[PDB]
Amino acid sequence: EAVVISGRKLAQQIKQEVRQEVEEWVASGNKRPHLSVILVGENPASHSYVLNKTRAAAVVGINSETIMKPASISEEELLNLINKLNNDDNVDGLLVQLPLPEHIDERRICNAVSPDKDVDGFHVINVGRMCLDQYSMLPATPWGVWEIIKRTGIPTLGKNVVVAGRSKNVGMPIAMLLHTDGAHERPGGDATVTISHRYTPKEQLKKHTILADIVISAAGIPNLITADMIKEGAAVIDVGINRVKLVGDVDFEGVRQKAGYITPVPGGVGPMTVAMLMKNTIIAAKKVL
Amino acid sequence: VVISGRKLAQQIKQEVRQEVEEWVASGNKRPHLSVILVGENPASHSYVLNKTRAAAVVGINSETIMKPASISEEELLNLINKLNNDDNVDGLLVQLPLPEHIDERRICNAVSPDKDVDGFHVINVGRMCLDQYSMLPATPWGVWEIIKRTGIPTLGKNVVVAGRSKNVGMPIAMLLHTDGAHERPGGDATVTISHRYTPKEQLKKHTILADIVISAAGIPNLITADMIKEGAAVIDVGINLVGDVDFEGVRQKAGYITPVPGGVGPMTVAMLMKNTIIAAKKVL
Ligand SMILES: NC(=O)c1ccc[n+]([C@@H]2O[C@H](COP(=O)([O-])OP(=O)(O)OC[C@H]3O[C@@H](n4cnc5c(N)ncnc54)[C@H](O)[C@@H]3O)[C@@H](O)[C@H]2O)c1
Ligand SMILES: NC(=O)c1ccc[n+]([C@@H]2O[C@H](COP(=O)([O-])OP(=O)(O)OC[C@H]3O[C@@H](n4cnc5c(N)ncnc54)[C@H](O)[C@@H]3O)[C@@H](O)[C@H]2O)c1
Ligand SMILES: Nc1nc(N)c(NC(=O)Nc2ccc(C(=O)N[C@@H](CCC(=O)O)C(=O)O)cc2Cl)c(=O)[nH]1
Ligand SMILES: Nc1nc(N)c(NC(=O)Nc2ccc(C(=O)N[C@@H](CCC(=O)O)C(=O)O)cc2Cl)c(=O)[nH]1
Numbered sequence: 147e148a149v150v151i152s153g154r155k156l157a158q159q160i161k162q163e164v165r166q167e168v169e170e171w172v173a174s175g176n177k178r179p180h181l182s183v184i185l186v187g188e189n190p191a192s193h194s195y196v197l198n199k200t201r202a203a204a205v206v207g208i209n210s211e212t213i214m215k216p217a218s219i220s221e222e223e224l225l226n227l228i229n230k231l232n233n234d235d236n237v238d239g240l241l242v243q244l245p246l247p248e249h250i251d252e253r254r255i256c257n258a259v260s261p262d263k264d265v266d267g268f269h270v271i272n273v274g275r276m277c278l279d280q281y282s283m284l285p286a287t288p289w290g291v292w293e294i295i296k297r298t299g300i301p302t303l304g305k306n307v308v309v310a311g312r313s314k315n316v317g318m319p320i321a322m323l324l325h326t327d328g329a330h331e332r333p334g335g336d337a338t339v340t341i342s343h344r345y346t347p348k349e350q351l352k353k354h355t356i357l358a359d360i361v362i363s364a365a366g367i368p369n370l371i372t373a374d375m376i377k378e379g380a381a382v383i384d385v386g387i388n389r390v391k392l393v394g395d396v397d398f399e400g401v402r403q404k405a406g407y408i409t410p411v412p413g414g415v416g417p418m419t420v421a422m423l424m425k426n427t428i429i430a431a432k433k434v435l
Numbered sequence: 436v437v438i439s440g441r442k443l444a445q446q447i448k449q450e451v452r453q454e455v456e457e458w459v460a461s462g463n464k465r466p467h468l469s470v471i472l473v474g475e476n477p478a479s480h481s482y483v484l485n486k487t488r489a490a491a492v493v494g495i496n497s498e499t500i501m502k503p504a505s506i507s508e509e510e511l512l513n514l515i516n517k518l519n520n521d522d523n524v525d526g527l528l529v530q531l532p533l534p535e536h537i538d539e540r541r542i543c544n545a546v547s548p549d550k551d552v553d554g555f556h557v558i559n560v561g562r563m564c565l566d567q568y569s570m571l572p573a574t575p576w577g578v579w580e581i582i583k584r585t586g587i588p589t590l591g592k593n594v595v596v597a598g599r600s601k602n603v604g605m606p607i608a609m610l611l612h613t614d615g616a617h618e619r620p621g622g623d624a625t626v627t628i629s630h631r632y633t634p635k636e637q638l639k640k641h642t643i644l645a646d647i648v649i650s651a652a653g654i655p656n657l658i659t660a661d662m663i664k665e666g667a668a669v670i671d672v673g674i675n676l677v678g679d680v681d682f683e684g685v686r687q688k689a690g691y692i693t694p695v696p697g698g699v700g701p702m703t704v705a706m707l708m709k710n711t712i713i714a715a716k717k718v719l
Contacts, residue, residue, distance in 0.1 A: 253565065253567070270558060270561040270562060270565065271557060271558065271561060272561075273561040273564055273565060274557035274558060274559075274560040274561025274562075274564065275557060275561075277560055277561065277564045277601070277605065278540065278557065278560055278601050279601070280540070280557075303632055304632045304633065304634055304637070306637060312612060312613065312614070314564070314565050314566070318564065321628075322564075325599060325628045325630065326599065327599070327630075336630070336632045338627065338628065338629050338630070338632075338633045338637055338638075338641070339627070339628050340625065340626070340627040340628075340641075341608070341612045341625065341626050341627075341628075342625050343612065343614075343623070343625070345590050345591045345623045345624075345625075346591065346625045347591055350591070350593060350625055350644075351625075353644060354593075354625070354627070354641075354644075357637075357640060357641075
């Protein structure tokens with residue numbers, strides 16, 4: 147039977163590490179870190195996720211605020227608020243929760259966040275630097291996926307990995323992190339990585355997953371990964387959060403009988419996203435990059 | 436089938452020449468490409484001369500600025516900055532590899548992004564990885580053009596890329612797997628990235644499934660006929676006289692194959708001409 151990896155337990159540990167780092171930072175005479183989150187509209191999942199982020203901020207001793215705005219806000223109004231926060235020296239980290247309304251360009255918004263406060267790692271320079279394996283602010287969900295694998299001791303060098311999903315904020319960075327050189331400035335996982343997406347035929351997906359030592363599903367499709375697609379002992383990491391009750395992309399009970407490792411939904415990658423954001427916020431407050 | 440890289444590059448260069456003539460006939464400045472060349476790498480000199488020959492034939496003015504390998508990083512940076520501010524210069528590229536004492540990423544980032552016809556500037560790398568309009572690196576774009584103009588489908592197909600280098604293998608994988616509907620369209624293929632830590636047996640287990648194998652590793656005979664699915668397309672990006680592919684053997688198994696020389700090589704030069712007219716038009 148498969149080890150269920152508790153993302154909540156891993157994330158709680160990581161937050162204790164950040165809390166100690168923040169306390170030593172403040173005891174050293176530096177200002178306490180402050181995270182600003184901009185929430186637009188009333189997407190219920192977004193409100194939940196931001197509450198988890200502000201909760202975690204309090205846990206690790208980082209000050210925070212959520213600024214909520216109606217979905218009817220204009221792009222220029224969002225850009226003025228972002229510029230205000232860019233110029234407020236008390237704000238160390240700034241993020242705009244996604245998705246945004248159709249009349250607001252996410253890329254222009256993400257690029258307006260000052261790169262030193264870009265705790266999401268969504269600024270184009272951070273994206274470019276990450277794709278060149280340079281030191282960068284790593285996006286929270288891909289980094290939490292990598293940390294799950296690393297802290298569980300699951301090997302990646304020379305191994306076969308399939309990522310289902312190519313979204314720019316989740317699936318593409320996960321594939322970048324896992325396939326790149328371990329020796330570069332920002333090390334990668336040195337895996338052989340297959341990127342699948344909405345136009346991969348289900349039979350070809352299975353033909354690649356059955357070879358995989360790690361399967362990482364970030365598609366948002368319930369029961370996309372089933373026990374027959376997984377080789378025995380493989381690690382399966384479920385990034386999907388599908389409202390159907392919340393399920394992942396993985397047939398949890400089915401794959402649990404064949405995988406070596408498996409993360410649950412909820413309580414797997416989600417809390418890890420929040421913990422890695424805390425790590426990015428103390429990194430931003432320290433002006434390391 | 437043996438795809439002629441020379442013939443496709445000829446058509447692309449004719450398209451650029453017509454685009455350049457129309458642009459000049461409408462009263463605009465004639466585009467100008469500046470190439471900086473460091474040292475005496477015989478392949479680099481050969482490649483740069485190919486680039487400047489193609490520029491002339493498509494109506495793009497050019498100059499190669501050659502410096503000794505003993506040049507220092509700050510002196511290369513000075514030359515780049517003067518060229519960045521010379522309004523006659525539309526495109527600027529520094530031929531790689533540079534001498535070991537020069538940081539290539541610092542050099543690539545010093546070229547103004549609007550003149551960065553290589554697409555090596557971090558902002559151009561980032562825009563490419565986000566599927567935004569960008570100057571595409573010429574060799575990866577040449578690979579994609581070979582595939583598209585030969586009419587070889589990508590959407591839903593299995594593609595293996597052998598190599599992960601930031602200038603060639605990674606942009607190739609990026610172009611091929613991404614969404615046809617985005618600003619800069621992609622191939623919508625299922626892409627496997629292999630590299631120097633992919634065991635040989637694992638490479639074959641993936642190529643054997645591939646409708647398109649793209650080899651960009653620089654290893655002679657890395658791709659042999661047993662690894663190839665019958666009827667698949669094999670694109671040899673490696674340059675060794677010989678490519679990465681065992682050309683003679685794979686010729687009998689593949690439905691399409693690309694020779695070395697005269698394959699991807701001339702397409703790289705052709706795609707640079709496209710980027711140069713794009714740069715002159717200041718569309719980005
Ligand atoms: N911390 C977390 O757990 C976390 C963080 C972010 C997102 N997510 C979840 O990830 C899922 C998607 O996230 P996103 O923001 O990347 O979504 P998105 O809608 O932007 O991307 C979905 C991706 O899935 C791919 N896909 C669709 N059908 C597929 C198929 N049949 N096979 C393979 N790939 C297929 C698409 O092509 C696309 O790349 C959702 O469940 C979302 O909640 C979870
Ligand atoms: N630079 C160009 O514009 C250009 C243009 C046309 C062709 N090429 C050719 O293609 C190559 C381009 O890559 P580069 O010059 O950046 O090379 P590089 O030395 O930076 O790396 C080549 C890649 O090959 C991979 N690789 C090594 N051994 C492998 C193996 N056994 N199996 C699978 N992958 C393996 C490596 O991990 C690496 O990603 C060159 O060697 C050249 O021959 C280059
Ligand atoms: N700017 C920006 N915009 C974004 N959208 C993101 N992504 C993001 O926040 N992801 C995210 C974060 C936390 C959770 C979480 O707490 N999950 C719990 C269940 C809670 C529940 O479902 O109620 C669980 O998994 O157990 C889940 C997700 Cl998807 C970002 O990082 N930056
Ligand atoms: N800044 C920067 N630096 C770089 N090094 C590159 N890459 C690059 O120039 N590649 C490149 C370009 C042309 C050829 C070519 O003409 N090939 C002929 C054979 C000619 C012969 O062998 O003499 C053939 O294959 O038929 C071959 C290659 Cl590898 C770049 O794009 N930008």
